[PDB]
């Protein structure tokens, strides 16, 4: 019955304005005892209050954001609004909205949230992965299966999309969480298979990056001893 | 700001265990009125936090009667009598008497299951890197339990511990390890100026250490 829906844009430049929209239903801003708050939580990590909005347009905002920070209201459109200024790298986070108990002393009991928007402040421009293939140590050894990976560095934004064999090789796979090398991003990926597998077979990384409309295919290939 | 702080950090559960989660505020949480504002909120992966204790002992409307919570001032408890699969994910405890809001840094409720030892794969940089001027040497340490692990870069005997990333998976769905990866990065002139290649793991499940390393020149 009650449904919170947030909004925005997903990428900004440092000192940028963020301004982003919690689109609601369920319940109506204008009746005593409703607030909207937003949240933010930074990948990982834990959540931070942002600000909280009354159904008396009263407002409340975290001290330590205050200057930056202005909660707003469209009671007729169901909007509650957040601007943000000056924005800088910190500010990357998913921000949620979410209503709280519906009671009458509201600052606690956040039952319904939002599905949350990813915000990422960054300056980076746009670039495409480099994407090596992880072939096993020039070598020789005579085990059942082998493991093989795929190395994707110097990208941005995030996400990157990494499958094996165009997705029909699926198992033993383990692709990792990108990491943040530098304003640009890195992930890697392994595979388990079989020996008889491989090089018998072809096993391909394949890495496409949307937001660059780039697609690398890399087959992975036996070392030389150069 | 009122210091919400949460221990464990990380509890390791079988399905069907009791689970006690402890939150202790850096100041007392009683109002002008009596009634104090202590919370629980739940979040799974790829969902959004759900509200499940308030008031420090009232259960939510829709939450199971294995979710109990009790304490008071400083020193609070969230206890959950038999640990079913849909309860695992991090629990936050909450404040709302005193503006800012917070929220303690959460507890990760995760799957016990029998050690494992990681299965490590070291890969010398790939000819194709070299060529525009990089050098990275990357290991992989799948498939291990519990989560704790340390990872050690040598080069030719000598650690390393500048540009080396690492990242690591979320507990497995099927098969409850963990696995990482860590790359160590270099300059293709630094990578060159040396030989031996060693990727160290340290895990409870052995007293020695699982090592994985190359020579550069001769294989």
């Known amino acids: 019955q009650v449904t919170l829906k947030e909004s925005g844009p997903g990428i900004l430049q440092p000192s940028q304005t963020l301004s982003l929209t919690c689109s609601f239903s369920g319940f109506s801003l204008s009746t005593s005892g409703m607030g909207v708050s937003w949240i933010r939580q930074p990948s990982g990590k834990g959540l931070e209050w942002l600000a909280h909005?009354?159904?008396?347009?009263?407002?409340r905002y975290n001290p330590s954001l205050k200057s930056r920070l202005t909660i707003s209201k469209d009671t007729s459109r169901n909007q509650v609004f957040l601007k943000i200024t000056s924005v800088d790298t910190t500010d990357t986070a998913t921000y949620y909205c979410?209503?709280?108990?519906?009671?009458?002393?509201?600052?606690?009991?956040?039952?319904?949230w939002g599905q949350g928007t990813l915000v990422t402040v960054s300056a980076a421009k746009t670039t495409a992965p480099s994407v090596y293939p992880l072939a096993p140590v020039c070598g020789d050894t005579t085990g059942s299966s082998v493991t093989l990976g795929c190395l994707v560095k110097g990208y941005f934004p995030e996400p990157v999309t990494l499958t094996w064999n165009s997705g029909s090789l699926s198992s033993g796979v383990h692709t990792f969480p990108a990491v943040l090398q530098s304003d640009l991003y890195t992930l890697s990926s392994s595979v388990t298979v079989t020996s008889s597998t491989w090089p018998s077979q072809s096993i391909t990384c394949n890495v496409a990056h949307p937001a660059s409309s780039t697609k690398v295919d890399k087959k992975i290939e036996p070392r030389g001893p150069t | 700001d009122v210091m919400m702080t949460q221990t464990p950090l990380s509890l390791p559960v079988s399905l069907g265990d009791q689970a006690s989660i402890s939150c202790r505020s850096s100041?007392?949480?009683?109002?002008?009125?009596?009634?104090?504002?202590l919370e629980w909120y739940m979040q799974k992966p790829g969902q959004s936090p759900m509200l499940l204790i308030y008031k420090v002992s009232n259960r939510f409307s829709g939450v199971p009667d294995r979710f109990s919570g009790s304490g008071s001032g400083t020193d609070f408890t969230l206890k959950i009598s038999s640990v079913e699969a849909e309860d695992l994910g991090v629990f936050y405890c909450?404040?709302?008497?005193?503006?800012?809001?917070?929220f303690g840094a959460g507890t990760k409720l995760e799957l016990k299951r029998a050690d494992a030892a990681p299965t490590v794969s070291i890969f010398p940089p790939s000819s194709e890197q070299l060529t525009s001027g990089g050098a990275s040497v990357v290991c992989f340490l799948n498939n291990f339990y519990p989560k704790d692990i340390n990872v050690k870069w040598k080069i030719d005997g000598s650690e390393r511990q500048n540009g080396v990333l690492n990242s690591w998976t979320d507990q497995d769905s099927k098969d409850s390890t963990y696995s990482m990866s860590s790359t160590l990065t270099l300059t293709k002139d630094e990578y060159e100026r040396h030989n031996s290649y060693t990727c160290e793991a340290t895990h409870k499940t052995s007293t020695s250490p699982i090592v994985k390393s190359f020579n550069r020149n001769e294989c």
């Open positions: 909005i009354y159904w008396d347009d009263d407002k």
């Open positions: 100041q007392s949480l009683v109002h002008s009125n009596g009634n104090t504002y």
């Open positions: 909450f404040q709302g008497s005193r503006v800012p809001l917070t």
């Open positions: 979410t209503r709280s108990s519906g009671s009458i002393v509201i600052a606690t009991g956040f039952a319904y």
